[PDB]
Each structure stands twice: as C-alpha cells, then as structure tokens.
C-alpha cells in the first residue's frame, strides 16, 4: 500500500545542566530505523533496524555530520526563540520538528511535511504546496522571514520530492520482508462480570503490524462509539502492536454485541462475539 518516512527531532535546553540536548529518530511507517543522541559518549547516527545496516560508511558519516551540525544549529535556535518570547534564561524549553514524505503504492509522492513546535505548541509549518509557510504568531514570523531569505522552502521541496522519496523506495525494497509485510491481529473477546446487572466485553487485537487498526463494538448492528472504551494502541516490543476495545453490556444481552476488526493484514474484516 502507501508508505511514509518521517524524522523526529527533539532539542531541549536545560540551564545549569549543560548545553541543550539534541535527539533525532527516523521511521519508515511504524518501524524506527535510525537514532542520534548528542548526549552519547560518542554521538553517531546509529542503526535501529537490520535493513539499514547495509548502508556504507559515507551514509553513516553524512547522517552523523548533519546531526552534529543540527545539534549546534538547534542550540542557536533555542537561544533565538527564548529571545523572541522574552523568556528568562532560567527555564527549560523544547523545539520539536517532524518532517518527511508519503508515497503511494506506485512509490509516487503523495505529500510532504515539515512542522516545528515550541514547548509543545505549533510554531511554524511548511504548507502542503511545499512553497509557503504558516507561522503561528509574531515570533514565528521572524523565523519565516529568515527562512524565506535562506530559500528554505525551495530546499525542502527539492528534498521532499527527490531524496525523501528515493530513499524511502530504497528502504522499502531493502526491508521488504518486514516493511511490506502486514501481520494481522490475533483476536479474542473476554467477558468480565461487573455486577449481577452488567459485564464488560473486551475485544482484543494482538501482534499486528502496522499500528493502524479499527476496532469497534456494535449492538444490534449499530456502532457504539460513545459507549466504547478504546485503549491507546501500544507497542509489544517485537515490532507489533496491541489494542483492545471494551463495552459494558446488560447481563444476558451479550449476544446482541459484535466486535468488528479491520486491519491490512487480514484477508477480510472480522466479526467476533463472546463465546462462553
């Protein structure tokens, strides 16, 4: 199907505790494949998926160089934004950035992304045209003018339409046995009496990849969106994910309830019920 590559940068100041830390991680879909941490004894871009290990030393040296440069540039950027918001030198602050590209099944660019945040709030984003910026406030307007003078949008459009798509296609091929393999969930329904009046039906999905999944409870065929408790999808640690959905049903009415599971790994969507 469709695929994505995303990089996630976190830069954190910590006054009185050294210079700001810079971390970068890269993902293809829901698979992390590289990391960098400026706090490491010897900071290097490092592999986190087997299929990236085959890249040569020039690859690792170049990505390390970019990340070491970024460590310094984000320290400057944190100093700049502290000034733009008239903030004291005593507080800790965070800049985050996420960027990358989505491609269709034919490998063609669906869209590109580049968004930055300051202390968890939207700060500046590259618009979908890959040519203009949306600045959140008058501080971000300063960054926008700097980036316009540096022709940043033009350079990101070149990256997003070129290298980002080309490297994503290379990774998808080199890791095809995992990145292009959808593992369906293992499913079951459990029954948890609450009282003599009510019980909990919990529909489980385990071992699936990628994380995208739809779990829903129906009562007599009608969706129970407002009444269904959905837990946040969680990583199992072996690349796969887990999720459950729960609904409180009147005792004796359990057969009116069906759990519906949609996932890319499944031959067809599943309908499940409690089987006492």
């Amino acid at each position: 199907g469709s695929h994505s590559m995303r990089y996630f940068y976190t830069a954190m100041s910590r006054p009185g505790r050294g210079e700001p830390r810079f971390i970068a991680v890269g993902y293809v879909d829901d698979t992390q494949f590289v990391r960098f941490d400026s706090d490491a004894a010897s900071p290097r871009m490092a592999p986190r998926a087997p299929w990236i290990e085959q890249e040569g030393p020039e690859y690792w040296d170049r990505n390390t160089q970019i990340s070491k440069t970024n460590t310094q540039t984000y320290r400057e950027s944190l100093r700049n934004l502290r000034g733009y918001y008239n903030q004291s030198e005593a507080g800790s602050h965070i800049i985050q950035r996420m960027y990358g590209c989505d491609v269709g099944p034919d490998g063609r660019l669906l869209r590109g992304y580049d968004q930055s945040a300051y202390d968890g709030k939207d700060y500046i984003a590259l618009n979908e045209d890959l040519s203009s910026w949306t600045a959140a406030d008058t501080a971000a307007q300063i960054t926008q003018r700097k980036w316009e003078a540096a022709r940043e949008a033009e350079q990101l459009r070149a990256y997003l339409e070129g290298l980002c798509v080309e490297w994503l296609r290379r990774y998808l091929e080199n890791g095809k046995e995992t990145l292009q393999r959808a593992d369906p969930p293992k499913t079951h329904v459990t029954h948890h009496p609450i009282s003599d009046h009510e019980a909990t039906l919990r529909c489980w999905a385990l071992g699936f990849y990628p994380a995208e999944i739809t779990l829903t409870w129906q009562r007599d065929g009608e969706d129970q969106t407002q009444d269904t408790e959905l837990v946040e999808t969680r990583p199992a640690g072996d690349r796969t994910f887990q999720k459950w959905a729960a609904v409180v049903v009147p005792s004796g009415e359990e057969q009116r309830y069906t759990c519906h599971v949609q996932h890319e790994g499944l031959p067809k969507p599943l309908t499940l019920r409690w089987e006492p």
Partner: peptide, 9 residues
C-alpha cells in the same frame, strides 16, 4: 536519509 542541515530558527 536525513535532510541537509537547515537554517536556524
């Protein structure tokens, strides 16, 4: 592959 290092904010 990372994007090249860009301009400070």
């Amino acid at each position: 592959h990372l994007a090249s290092s860009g301009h400070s904010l």
